[PDB]
Amino acid sequence: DEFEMIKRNTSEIISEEELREVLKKDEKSAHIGFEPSGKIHLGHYLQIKKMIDLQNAGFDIGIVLADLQAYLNQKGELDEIRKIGDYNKKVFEAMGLKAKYVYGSEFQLDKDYTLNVYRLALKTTLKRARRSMELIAREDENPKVAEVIYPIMQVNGGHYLGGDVAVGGMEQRKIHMLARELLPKKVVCIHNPVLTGLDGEGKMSSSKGNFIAVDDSPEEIRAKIKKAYCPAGVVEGNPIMEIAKYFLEYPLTIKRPEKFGGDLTVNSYEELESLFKNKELHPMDLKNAVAEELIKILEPIRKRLLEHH
Amino acid sequence: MDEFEMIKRNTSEIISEEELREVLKKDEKSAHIGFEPSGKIHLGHYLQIKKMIDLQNAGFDIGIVLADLQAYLNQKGELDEIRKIGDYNKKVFEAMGLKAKYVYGSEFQLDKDYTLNVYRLALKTTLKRARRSMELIAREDENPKVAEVIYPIMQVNGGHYLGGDVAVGGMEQRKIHMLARELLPKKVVCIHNPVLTGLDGEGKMSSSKGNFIAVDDSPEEIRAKIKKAYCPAGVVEGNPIMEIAKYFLEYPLTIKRPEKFGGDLTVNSYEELESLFKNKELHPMDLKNAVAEELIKILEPIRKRLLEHH
Ligand SMILES: C[Si](C)(C)c1ccc(C[C@H](N)C(=O)O)cc1
């Protein structure tokens, strides 16, 4: 076990029965890959948190700084991508995760890795490949061959790492299903929710400027939350409610003037959810509480990233 | 003879003639072609090898890529099986009299540097472009594979890796070749050979279609295939027998004929043979019989070299 702790705040495990089997082993391993990102935001942190969960549960953690994939996803030049990966590694360690950090290009260009990419290319239809990239592929009016190489590259990555568990965001689930159908060793997949962007108009993303970075200043965090989409009574699609759900600790103390109800103690996110859905808790008061608790959560991350000056 | 005209003869397309002249000014110059290994080597293969000998006769160092990785990506089986067919293809090409550098594509196409550049070209090649370039090359498939769109860029980078001045192939290769001219910094001169018509007259000739004459077909099989072949009187376009006459027969040619039907005709040019056949002067039956016996004699030293171990 540790099963329930691992399942907490994930969208799906494929499959739970297979995960319980993995959890019986003395030795188990789990991996995730991150295309390097110039800013590291709460979407990354949610995933790192889950890797820390797995680590707490006796999993050896592997982190792929997926520079080759970022390159195939048109994020730029390989050496420039790798340097952002270097910075991403420091952020992940500052979040509390000690793990094995590999750059994808350390093994994803070996001849026998490459031969298996082409073997997998013989078994992956263009349709399957294109459909697995719909939520991942950079936007492009003239889609590139690189886009359908990207998923078979990610599948072969998992093949060569040989872990028991693969972790990723829900946008990754079609690539994960492709690896389960194509590979001899079937990996247990754990998928994290994809956070909603701050203006509520889509999914949070490094390229859309609609995120909170883990090293944003408290003042920037307060401004981003203040201006955030947060309809009273509306929980689904609400970025503020999501932050409250996936990062904050409970009981939660929501401070208010006496004229609007005075201070409030919420013992659970579910309790928080009905209060807000009922319109008992106003969006301004929710924002203030989420902002101040989130600043404290991100405080020691930001400090370690800045304490060199 | 003039090197340019010797290279140009019986080709369908040069990209471009002006770049071909500038390459022929150089003392050191190379040409290359790839072949997916094929269980039977046929007249379409022969025509291309004859063009490589032309180029070699004009001072080009020849490279022949036995294209095993590409054949692998194009669903021709496993590499060891493919490579073994490649070994056989190499003997046939030599039995055709082509001394050249023979390479297996896999020898260099899985290198780390090579692979990175494949991925780089994949960023610059659209899916629609890649698929268009493969329309005459891809193995038929109800559910097309990613392998199909990797194939063109594998071929493109292969030429980039070979450093050749000239790239030779059939007309089915011309989209891949124009893609290579767009994407690479050295623009390669492309010499395209015609694709022969099938022996039944319908559609192009193809290993997969079994509508060809193999260079090691027995005389009786050759005569039989030719006797069967589509050959309307006075119909030159799409006439596989007239194609063979034009691309493989040697002139002046002596069409044997009964005296009762005119006697031996000595045609010293394909063009007149065309004009003769055009005006229905020269009958199909008489054309088939001359083409079959000439071709048998053309192909005889090759079949002999290949059957010599027996
Ligand atoms: C530019 Si090259 C010498 C790496 C090259 C050329 C042609 C081929 C094979 C051809 N497409 C076929 O179907 O036989 C392979 C490689």
Numbering used by the authors:
A (entry chain A): 2 to 310
B (entry chain B): 1 to 310
Text of the article:
To make the 1D 1H-NMR method broadly applicable for the investigation of dynamic conformation change in both small proteins and large membrane protein complexes, we report the highly efficient and selective incorporation of TMSiPhe in proteins in Escherichia coli cells. The Key to the success of this method was the identification of a mutant Methanococcus jannaschii tyrosyl-tRNA synthetase (TyrRS) that exhibits high specificity toward 4-trimethylsilyl phenylalanine (TMSiPhe) in E. coli cells. In particular, the low electronegativity of Si led to a uniquely low 1H chemical shift for CH3-Si (typically <0.55 ppm), which could be easily identified from the complicated 1H spectra of macro-biomolecules.
To investigate the molecular basis of the selective recognition of TMSiPhe by TMSiPheRS, we crystallized TMSiPheRS and analyzed the structures by X-ray crystallography. The crystal structures of TMSiPheRS alone and the complex of TMSiPheRS with TMSiPhe were determined at 1.8 Å and 2.1 Å, respectively. The 2Fo-Fc annealing omit map of the TMSiPheRS/TMSiPhe complex unambiguously assigned the electron density for TMSiPhe. Introduction of the TMS group significantly increased the volume of the amino-acid substrate by ~60%. To compensate for this substantial change in volume, three residues, namely, D158, I159, and V164, were replaced by the smallest amino-acid glycine, and Y32 and L65 were substituted by the relatively small residues H32 and V65, respectively. We then compared the crystal structure of the TMSiPheRS/TMSiPhe complex with that of apo TMSiPheRS. Compared with the structure of TMSiPheRS alone, we observed a dramatic 120-degree rotation of histidine 32 in response to TMSiPhe binding. Moreover, Leu162 rotated ~42 degrees to form hydrophobic interactions with the methyl groups of TMSiPhe. Altogether, G34, V65, Q70, F108, Q109, Y151, Q155, G158, G159, Q173, and H177 defined a hydrophobic pocket for the accommodation of and specific interactions with the phenyl ring and TMS group of TMSiPhe.
